[PDB]
Design a protein around this ligand. Structure first.
Ligand code: NI
Ligand code: NI
Ligand code: NI
Ligand code: NI
Lengths: 132, 564, 100, 564, 132, 100
């Protein structure tokens, strides 16, 4: 109310917050095939997560988890979880992580074909050991 | 996806429409604007967003305009920007941007200039309030240690004078003459606050004034103690206009050469700063308060009368009677009626600044405390200001904040470099916990480095373990303390090479825009009403309305918070 | 002929007005530059012919009509000014609202 | 007292709510805001307000921040400020303030920084429009005389390249190599426009690119004529990101090494400026226009296709066939469908900049003319933009203005110094009569001095007598022409001492913020829709909607105004 | 309308402009006692106008004419006109003109007395020849 | 009249073509500059008259013959180009092999 708020407290409105609303969502199925727990955050390039995670890696190309900024998803050993994926914004330029892309992850301009740098990436994942 | 406010707040703090209680006060601020979108929220940590190639750029060198520091998800309480939620960015000890921080490679809506990178450090502002650091215009340079008491209440700039505990300094804000000025410039190099020095104004020709101007002062102080004559005023102001510097005044309490009206005429419509405008701290008795009606007067109060309390009359009485080693001077000096009036006029926007009068009747470490204490006593007695919005106290709070921030700056001609959280300004900033707002800050950021902070056991495994007490930091250390601190001077002095001549390592910055300003240039405190004081009963009428309020028994942000 | 800058500059006027007079005679509705040219030269030529400032002024305020110009050009030519060489010397001629 | 609007306007020009017709167009602008009060109106003249001790301050020296110049009672048309009525003030060749000018001694409400004084000159803006000067990003340095044609249409900044009329310059915006660059830097010292030079991007290692960077270029131009390869692109962009400079492109028209999609992939999501985005001027045939969908692309059109007219196809056909001394390259290059599409996309905010392609298919002295011509043809065909306000064309006009002003600046990393009428910016300004808006300016103000103007008989008794023609002024004279003009360079170059090394007297300013920008940072032209082109019929679909309009017979600001 | 506006023309709204509304108005009577025309502008310090003008000079202290900025009032020889007067704004600091004031022209703080610098000014006018 | 550099430059064309047209009317066979002048102005004037680029082109390719020029001039004038101000704006006119 105001009469009830603690010292330094907040009076929060009611309306929920809506985030990532515009962005197209890809669901992938993720199995942890290692013996150790794996935890992945909101802004990590899902494509490039721990080799031991087995999922449709091609589908995670240019993608992140569609969760709250700063939060994470925990993949315990030998468990299966479905996760929502969304594309990165801005320029869709991804440098670093596991050095799988080190570039542009966008779709480009041709609907119903793949860019060759994507197929390169995907091939390279495969032979660096990134489970699909 | 969709997230609850309560969950959002816990992660990121409050957003637009959310309300924050400022301590144990009854003041509630409300976020007006949220500049940092939704879903791409920049936070420092393990497993969080400001990691390499994600929220942080990892390929850009610093010369691409990458930040040196970022303060994230912070609530900005500023007299010019208002009450907003933003990311704040610092580069080259300056505010580069207010907006959305991150990595444009992977993020939409990054404010230009707010690119976080390899160069960037971080401060988590989620549950914090960010203010401009306060500015104390009425400092007596009695004790170097005052600086520490000040930093510890969120003040980082001193305007005044003195030469340590001499009888002249104990009474006035004067650093007399070119030798003493030089000395004092050199000394303050050892202090972790910005400084500008005031000179002695009581002179007959131009010579003695010009002297001090070139030596480096930012102002002239006209005081009774050295003579608050028409002559003094007149020559001081004429010089001031020449030198683009300020004049501050402590008027004749005895009415020896004149009444207030004659003083007013000595001002000769020229810009002037009027200390302790009420009179408890000095001035034409009973009625110095009438100077607050004039457009050329930039009025200030000293902080021991604010807020007005039940012990206020007892204190002040006894104080003068020792201040002046002394009864009809006393009970004429100390007037319940005008003290109450001062309180009201503050709330109206008629007295434009708070000040300390440090160890010459006021409290250097209580300006941010007392401001908040006053706002809250006044809400109680008067209710909502007419311009307040019904659900919140923003209008009010912001009036008060202007008093210790932007208004002092404007008065002394330093608003170009300090006093507001605005792009292009020196990062002289304070971080607060809402729970402790006004009273006990988290940190002080002084020229882009943390200079002062509440720090516990340096041997401990965290920074938080007890005892927690205020301590200098690295910005307060070595050659950085000078690098990050400004010594304000006259353009005359700057041009004459004061920096070389005096051998100063501080940043040396010319004051500017002191003489073209008026009361109406002041922020949220621009009112010039008719003020009348009754020479018998000392009663104050403001546009014909009796200006009073009742004393408080209990102050907020007070015995709960302090051992002192 | 020892042509001075003022003399040379005036050749531009003569060249544009010749073009302009040819166009008007084809029935073309004149534009801004063209119209200004014709008024200017009318004055100038009057001066040379020995008329008064007063008299040339009249003459020049009457050479072009609304019909003879493209719609709106009037709004573009509130007044025209030129210095001409009269019998008594160089003089400024203002021509007020020439397209009536 | 009370005065009629009509009488007021006659004295002071239009105020808030008043509407102004931009030439012979059907565009009507409306004043949004009036910053300069009522009753204290600053005007220069005999018996007027800006006289000594009255509107003008007569006691303040210049170091008090008195102005060097004031432009009074002017209508500001700017893409960031909008459509306002204000006083504009200049100090140290910079915009100090926008607001109410005068003398605070005798006047209420003088904007800080807008003190008129002994130092101040004056321009009467009452019946005038003030714009930022245009910026032409696609200049071929074929002829030095282009500068004069440009200034005469309100353009004062050139970005491009060349080395005079060589076959390489006739076709491309390249100044190849460190010798040629040095030469060209030195030459432009003789020109009364700002300049930045572009280099040759078609290189395999870093060496040849770095060379030119240090020598002083602001950019690299990738052209078919020298090879518009994936290799070129890739190395150019990688270097660019290193050097904080821009890359501009003229793509492969022949589809030799690829289609547009492959070009796109060569960009590798990196910031790039795309010239003649439609393709009539060069590019992947038929469908280079699809690059306008991408967030990393900063698109431009050259000015000969805008507006689309009845003679446009005839012209262009014949032009290429001589440009390339030549028919299936021709009718594939010159596509009515995509030309119309360009027009529409402009109006949508999908193509973000106008440019000339000077003496390489476009018209250096027609950018401001054509912009206005396009806005007006498009209003006619499409009506009001959805975001327009019903009574006025502000939204529209302002979109278009961004195209020749702020957007070019942003693209080349000079918005910090030029492109908008905003405080702290270089005074690169244009004054127009509404009657002549876009077509024929009054004057150009170039670094705070009038450099170029419409001037009649220098022997006459006034400045207005015939013949009136464009002429250099004092800012265009002597050592001031260099003092008032900027040569843009790379930070690399700046840091290496280009100014000394090359012996330049121009102002030398480092480009900055070229690589972190995207389409969305562009002002009023930030749209990224889906664009599809039909490889048979060349038809363009924008988010599935056919993008066409019909050619104009009659252009506005055209045969009425010009003898040319 | 829009269909009728000339090239570069303005479409003006209807609402009149109101200026100087807050400011207190003093009417004075002015006679030109010289043989030559006198014309005074809006921002001139009325107190200090041409010696030959005869009016209540004391009443014009700190005052200007309550007319449109940039305009003027013409006082032909031997004619009498009433004029509206209003105070100057800002700081009410008047330097120059005929060197009668060279200062502050405000009222100050005491209702039903005059400041002495005003009385000085007024006396000085009188003996410099400024007709009252 | 607020003449721009492009406007002023075009006065040269008008002056040389007037001389050229006078010469042709005396029966003089034209030279290179003169011939180029006449073709150029023909286009320019067409533009002003309201014609299309297509139409002016034809017109200009027909004004001069082999007979009307000095032997060889044809070889010197393979094409003529000028920018003219058409109803829809400034446009380039190329005139192909004008001396037939
Ligand atoms: Ni004091
Ligand atoms: Ni004191
Ligand atoms: Ni090109
Ligand atoms: Ni080009």
């Amino acid at each position: 109310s105001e009469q009830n708020t603690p010292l330094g407290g907040c009076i929060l409105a009611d309306t929920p917050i809506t985030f990532n609303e515009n962005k197209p969502v890809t669901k992938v199925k993720v199995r942890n095939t290692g013996d150790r727990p794996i935890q992945v955050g909101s802004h990590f390039h899902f494509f490039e997560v721990n080799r031991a995670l087995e999922f449709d890696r091609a589908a995670a190309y240019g993608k992140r988890l569609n969760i709250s900024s700063t939060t994470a998803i925990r993949f315990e050993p030998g468990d299966e979880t479905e996760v929502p994926l969304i594309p990165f914004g801005g320029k869709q330029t991804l440098y670093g992580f596991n050095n799988l892309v080190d570039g542009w992850t966008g779709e480009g301009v041709v609907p119903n074909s793949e860019r060759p740098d994507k197929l390169e990436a995907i091939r390279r994942a495969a032979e660096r050991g990134f489970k699909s | 996806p969709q997230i609850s406010r309560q969950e959002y707040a816990g992660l990121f703090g409050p957003t637009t429409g959310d309300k924050i209680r400022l301590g144990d006060t009854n003041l509630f601020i409300e976020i007006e604007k949220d500049l940092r979108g939704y879903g791409e929220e920049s936070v420092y940590g393990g497993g969080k967003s400001l990691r390499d190639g994600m929220g942080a750029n990892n390929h850009l060198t610093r010369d691409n305009g990458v930040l040196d520091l970022v303060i994230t998800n912070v609530t900005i309480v500023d007299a010019r920007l208002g009450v907003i939620k933003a990311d704040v960015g610092i580069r080259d000890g300056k505010i580069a941007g207010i907006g959305k921080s991150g990595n444009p490679g992977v993020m939409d809506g990054v404010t230009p200039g707010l690119v976080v990178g390899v160069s960037t450090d971080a401060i988590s502002g989620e549950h914090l309030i960010l203010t401009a650091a306060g500015i104390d215009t009425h400092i007596h340079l009695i004790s170097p240690q005052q600086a520490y008491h000040a930093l510890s209440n969120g003040v980082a700039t001193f305007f005044g004078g003195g030469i340590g505990p001499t009888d002249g300094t104990n009474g006035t804000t004067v650093t007399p003459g070119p030798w003493n000025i030089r000395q004092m410039l050199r000394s303050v190099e050892g202090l972790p606050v910005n400084v500008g020095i005031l000179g002695k104004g009581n002179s007959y020709g131009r010579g003695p004034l010009l002297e001090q101007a070139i030596a480096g002062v930012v102002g002239y102080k006209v005081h009774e103690d050295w003579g608050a004559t028409a002559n003094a005023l007149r020559h001081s102001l004429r010089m001031a206009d020449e030198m683009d510097i300020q004049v501050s005044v402590h008027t004749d309490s005895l009415n020896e050469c004149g009444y207030v009206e004659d003083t007013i005429d000595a001002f000769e419509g020229r810009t002037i700063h009027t200390f302790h405008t009420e009179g408890a701290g000095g001035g034409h008795a009973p009625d110095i308060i009438r100077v607050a009606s004039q457009p050329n007067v930039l009025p200030s109060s000293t902080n021991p009368t604010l807020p007005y309390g039940v012990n206020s009359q007892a204190e002040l009485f006894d104080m003068i009677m020792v201040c002046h080693n002394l009864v009809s001077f006393a009970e004429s000096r100390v007037r319940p009626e005008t003290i109450a009036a001062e309180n009201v006029l503050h709330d109206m926007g008629v007295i434009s600044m708070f000040s300390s009068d440090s160890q010459a009747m006021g409290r250097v470490g209580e300006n941010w405390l007392r401001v908040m204490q006053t706002a809250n006593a006044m809400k109680a007695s008067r209710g909502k200001l007419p311009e307040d919005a019904p659900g919140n106290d923003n209008f009010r709070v912001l009036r008060y904040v202007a008093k210790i921030t932007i208004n002092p700056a404007i008065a002394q001609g330093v608003s170009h470099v300090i006093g507001s959280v605005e792009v292009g300004k020196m990062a002289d900033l304070v971080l607060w916990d809402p729970r402790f707002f006004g009273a006990k800050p988290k940190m002080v950021i002084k020229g882009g480095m943390i200079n002062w902070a509440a720090m516990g056991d340096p041997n401990a495994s965290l920074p938080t373990p007890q005892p927690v007490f205020y301590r200098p930091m690295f910005g307060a250390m070595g050659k950085t303390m000078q690098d990050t601190c400004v010594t304000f001077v006259s353009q005359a002095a700057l041009d004459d090479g004061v920096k070389e001549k005096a051998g100063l390592d501080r940043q040396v910055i010319a004051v500017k825009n002191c003489r073209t300003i008026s009361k109406h240039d002041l922020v949220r405190n621009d009112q010039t009403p008719n003020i009348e004081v009754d020479p018998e009963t000392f009663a104050v009428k403001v546009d014909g309305v009796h200006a009073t309020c009742e004393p408080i028994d209990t102050a907020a942000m007070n015995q709960r918070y302090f051992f002192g | 002929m020892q042509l001075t800058p003022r003399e040379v500059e005036k050749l531009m006027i003569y060249t544009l007005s010749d073009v302009a007079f040819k166009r008007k005679a084809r029935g073309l509705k004149l534009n801004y530059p063209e119209a200004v040219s014709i008024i200017t030269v009318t004055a100038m030529e009057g001066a040379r012919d020995g008329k008064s400032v007063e008299d040339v002024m009249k003459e020049a305020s009457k050479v072009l009509t609304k019909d003879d110009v493209m719609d709106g050009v009037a709004d573009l030519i509130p007044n025209v000014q030129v210095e001409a060489i009269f019998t008594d010397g160089s003089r400024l001629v203002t021509v007020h609202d020439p397209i009536k």
